[PDB]
């Protein structure tokens, strides 16, 4: 079968662990696809996004330093991402590119699940190299769910991440 | 873990390709951090796709119908052999600079010499058809020590035009009718037309009536794995070859151009044949 293409856009991206967790998750769920790393120099972000649409790449995550840069090139941006003024997740719907930001929701969810608490109280270090691991995994999983419609096994993603960071 | 490099095919359509099958298996057997994908590119979306290749850092892509001519303006450089053919089927991305090549000719030739264990020295060759699928083969054959490379085509003027681009000292142009009458004058006969290809199988590129026994009859068609033409040639005592080899060597040459390593062609043929017989 023809696998769909996904990946991470950023500069640098070579040491990202997103491929590790996403690819294991695709396989686990029998999803014909692969997650890659796209090193995009500042100045070519416009061409990278136009490139995503033209090549039919299914979707891409966006890390430093393009979260803000990709916005003018999308066809639609989620009100939340607009407000934040940053996008870390893009999906290509038959040519229409929509931007989302799962960094926040991801931090929150990973917090209350890893700490087993509820923010309704006063209402951790995101650096993973509480860890930022939970955040890395959850923001990715939210993106994974947007693309595939399936919520991946986060415990497995965390396990692979941690093991690698060690 | 290492960053996988991205390769793929651009065209419209691309889903039928066997390149992923071949390349992904080769990357695995050789321990190469990479994957070959399929990228559908609509006519008029070529400039954006190429710009994408540069921006995203895609290592290389093959090009097929109907973009082999259309991609040229977006390339920084085009190999001399590809410029002569006027089509690019292989692009390598050298850290931002795109160079195009065409593996048609060498793919065919190298597969012929190896599969049939022969040298082209002094061979009298007849190429049938004068289309894009024949230009690479024709030009590469001219670079060998073949005795002659003649060309036959239904519309003789197209063959004449191509021969003028060639030598004219070792190559003459003929109509299919003329070619059939002098079919005995050739050591190797090559069909580059799609006559006999799926689904219109019960027809042949040209009559083998005057074919000599023991000569080589080469058909680049690989679907079916044996055209009516090849079957009859075998019956007439000819050594035969379908296009599987060309397809494979086209892939191997691009693969080597990209990685610097020559893949296992027998393994590639094995997978290809299985996919075709499926
Ligand atoms: Cl012409
Ligand atoms: Cl072929």
């Amino acid at each position: 079968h023809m696998e769909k293409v996904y990946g991470l856009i950023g500069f640098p991206v070579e040491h990202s662990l997103s491929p590790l967790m996403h690819n294991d998750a695709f396989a686990r769920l029998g999803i014909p696809a692969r997650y890659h790393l796209f090193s995009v120099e500042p100045g070519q972000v416009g061409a990278a996004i136009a490139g995503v649409r033209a090549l039919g790449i299914a979707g891409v995550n966006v890390t430093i330093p393009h979260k803000l840069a990709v916005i003018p090139f999308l066809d639609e941006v989620d009100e939340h991402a607009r407000r934040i003024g940053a996008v870390n997740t893009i999906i290509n719907n038959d040519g229409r590119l929509v931007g989302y930001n799962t960094d926040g929701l991801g931090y929150v969810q990973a917090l209350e699940e890893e700490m087993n608490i509820t923010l309704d109280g006063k209402r951790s270090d995101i650096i993973y190299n509480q860890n930022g691991v939970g955040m890395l995994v959850y923001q990715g999983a939210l993106a994974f769910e947007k693309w595939t419609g399936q919520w991946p096994d986060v415990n497995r993603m965390k396990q692979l991440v941690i093991e690698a960071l060690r």
Side-chain angles (χ1 to χ4, degrees), chain A:
Chain A
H1 192 301
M2 180 168 127
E3 27 188 50
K4 289 189 173 182
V5 177
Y6 295 89
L8 172 66
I9 281 177
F11 195 66
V13 296
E14 74 174 305
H15 291 133
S16 177
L17 292 172
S18 281
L20 180 64
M21 62 183 84
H22 289 95
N23 288 321
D24 175 82
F26 279 138
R28 174 169 177 283
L29 300 170
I31 294 175
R34 193 154 189 80
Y35 190 103
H36 289 289
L37 299 177
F38 302 116
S39 184
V40 179
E41 285 192 51
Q44 308 189 209
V45 176
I49 299 306
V52 164
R53 178 183 304 99
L55 292 166
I57 283 165
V60 299
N61 279 142
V62 188
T63 184
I64 294 175
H66 309 315
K67 295 193 179 68
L68 207 191
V70 305
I71 296 184
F73 309 114
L74 302 174
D75 299 291
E76 185 184 305
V77 184
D78 181 63
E79 187 176 302
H80 183 228
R82 286 187 293 176
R83 174 165 181 169
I84 298 183
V87 168
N88 83 317
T89 299
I90 297 173
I91 180 179
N92 183 345
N93 298 317
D94 189 3
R96 189 181 173 68
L97 276 36
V98 187
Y100 292 102
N101 195 314
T102 65
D103 285 301
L105 193 68
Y107 172 80
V108 176
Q109 277 181 33
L111 182 62
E112 41 188 53
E113 180 61 68
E114 181 174 355
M115 303 294 93
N116 189 185
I117 70 180
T118 295
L119 295 188
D120 300 57
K122 353 193 68 56
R123 137 183 297 246
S124 59
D125 189 4
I126 76 176
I127 296 176
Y128 55 81
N129 182 53
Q130 176 189 53
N131 277 330
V133 179
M135 180 189 199
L136 167 57
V137 177
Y138 276 79
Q139 63 80 30
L142 291 170
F144 190 110
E145 177 171 72
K146 280 186 174 304
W147 298 326
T148 72
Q150 300 182 54
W151 178 260
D153 182 327
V154 303
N155 299 304
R156 167 63 172 183
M157 292 176 72
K158 279 177 56 64
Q159 180 185 297
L160 286 178
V161 177
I162 296 175
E163 178 177 61
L165 250 17
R166 294 176 176 170

